């Protein structure tokens, strides 16, 4: 309406919602489909679920490599959305028990899962980079609000999925048997709708062309830089003032600078997988903690598992609260939150959330059940962790964009998602080790988060901003 926000983002945000919703609709039923339709092991079902999740987390590499080196965005997004839709077609087509059995179902399900992972890893970074690219580089104030609304749409899709998916798998009769075809068809239709709404804004988007084989040039420049300093028995100036400064006999400065910026941001992100792994220990351990506290609430019996819903919901209350109020208040005075202090204070908030969880666990273990904790008293730690997530993830998206060279805007987003992926891998590997008391586990997680925050703050103090 004459503002600084292009109408085109209206198509992007509405797309991402329709995507996340669909994704969270398909993932939720996934395990059950393995167990009660394909009749797989608990081991096999869990392994396939985790492998699918890891592939979804790691395909952003392929997505960004395509987008920033070839076809640009809006053609990586379009084609990978088509791949996503084909994967959904196979998934739903492989869940109707009328054709084949135990051989066609398995193959179709696995192929659909692979295609879904490929599509997700390549609709994730490219869509965010595209929406950011819709804004002029001078409009960094509106781009932050756009990223806040992007995260808000993601979380709203997650919440609506958690609230609507059981309605689709409850007492349905696809073919003399539970209706898993609908549980995947509805996400498939939502993905198709997301693709349609995205493609309907084609005439409005601000498609910037790719700048060449960015990935190949970056790899070649780094390899030449690391090979040229090898002046073992001789040499006087292998590479001075940086490890990229004498990789300049080729690769003009306009590429050396971009490689430098990418390297700086990657070094900054180095410890983020640890933070993601530590923060992810709140959808499982906190459910176990909630299992040991009263959940009547006096009004409605609240199952511990339902407490998970409090993560997205609180975010929907903090994203507008922060971006519109708290941050504004921080800007009322001289205080300068530089998008890297926001992330550090978010890490600190997560550390405090796990410290509060440890204190609550100690209080639970202090029973002797007159002093039985309600399902409340889990509210403070959820509030703290959700505030940490809001102040970290949105700021990290904006930081990955604003600090990315124009030629590799969707590669820094891929690096962000890959920190998330490595955090997931760390979670997977550490899940097999459990020999500590729950209160000691929470204390250890809080201490580890404090150490991670300290390391990240020290590294971000010496970070050289792109400019």
């Amino acid at each position: 309406f004459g503002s600084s926000y292009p109408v085109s983002i209206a198509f992007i945000v509405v797309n991402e919602f329709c995507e996340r919703f669909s994704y969270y609709g398909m993932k939720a039923v996934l395990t059950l489909y393995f167990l009660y339709f394909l009749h797989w092991n608990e081991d096999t079902s869990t392994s396939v679920y985790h492998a699918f999740s890891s592939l979804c987390y790691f395909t952003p590499i392929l997505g960004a490599a395509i987008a920033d080196s070839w076809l640009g965005k809006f053609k990586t997004i379009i084609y990978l959305s088509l791949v996503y839709v084909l994967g959904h077609v196979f998934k739903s087509l492989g869940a109707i028990p009328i054709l084949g059995g135990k051989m066609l179902h398995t193959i179709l399900s696995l192929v659909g899962l692979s295609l879904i992972a490929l599509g997700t890893g390549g609709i994730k970074p490219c869509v965010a980079a595209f929406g950011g690219d819709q804004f002029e580089e001078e409009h960094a104030e509106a781009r932050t609000r756009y990223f806040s609304v992007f995260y808000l749409a993601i979380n709203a899709g997650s919440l609506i999925s958690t609230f609507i998916t059981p309605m689709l798998r409850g007492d349905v009769k696809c073919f003399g048997q539970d209706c898993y075809a609908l549980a995947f068809g509805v996400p498939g239709l939502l993905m198709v709708l997301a693709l349609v709404v995205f493609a309907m804004g084609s005439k409005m988007y601000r498609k910037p062309p790719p700048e060449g084989n960015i990935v190949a040039q970056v790899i070649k420049c780094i390899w030449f830089a690391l090979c040229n300093r090898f002046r073992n028995r001789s040499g006087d100036l292998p590479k001075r003032q940086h490890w990229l400064d004498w990789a300049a006999e080729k690769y003009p400065k306009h590429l050396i600078a971009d490689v430098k910026a990418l390297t700086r941001v990657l070094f900054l992100y180095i410890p983020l997988p640890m933070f993601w792994a530590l923060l992810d220990q709140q959808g499982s351990r906190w459910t176990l903690q909630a299992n040991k506290m009263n959940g009547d609430l006096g009004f409605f019996v609240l199952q511990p598992d339902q407490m998970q819903v409090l993560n997205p919901f609180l975010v929907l209350i903090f994203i507008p609260l922060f971006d519109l109020v708290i941050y504004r208040l921080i800007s009322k005075c001289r205080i300068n939150f530089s998008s890297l202090r926001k992330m550090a204070v978010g890490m600190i908030l997560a550390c405090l959330a796990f410290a509060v969880a440890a204190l609550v666990e100690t209080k639970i273990n202090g029973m002797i059940p007159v002093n039985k904790l309600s399902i409340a008293w889990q509210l403070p730690q959820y509030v703290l962790v959700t505030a940490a997530e809001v102040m970290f993830s949105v700021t990290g998206l904006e930081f990955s964009y604003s600090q990315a060279p124009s030629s590799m805007k969707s590669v820094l987003q891929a690096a962000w998602l890959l920190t998330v992926a490595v955090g997931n891998i760390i979670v997977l590997v550490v899940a097999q080790f459990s020999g500590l008391a729950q209160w000691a586990e929470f204390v250890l997680f809080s201490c580890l988060l404090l150490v991670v925050c300290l390391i990240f703050s020290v590294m971000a103090y010496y970070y050289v901003p792109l400019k």
Partner: nanobody
Amino acid sequence: QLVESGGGLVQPGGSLRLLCVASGRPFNDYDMGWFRQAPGKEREFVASISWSGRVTDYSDSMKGRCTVSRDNAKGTMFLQMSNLVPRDTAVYYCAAARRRWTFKATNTEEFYETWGQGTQVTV
């Protein structure tokens, strides 16, 4: 390994509780399931319980209703049938399968490698 099943006769419309005792190796490393072989029939899947007990499945019949559940300590797994009808007058086998990655259907005989002895639960 070396699963032993113990049941007995019951009356129509009553509830019976079969027991499967596994001895020799840990009971937290085995996916377990129940099968029945009515005289003249091949074998019918009855119920399944995973190694951890979290995942439990029952055949379409599961006459009236069933409830399978294991106790990894002492290796006792039991099946709780409630509304037994003149059918299901069959020997109930106990099948034990180790933990492993596989695409075999958990509700089939091919999936399970260790079979116990039957128990004639007539009605």
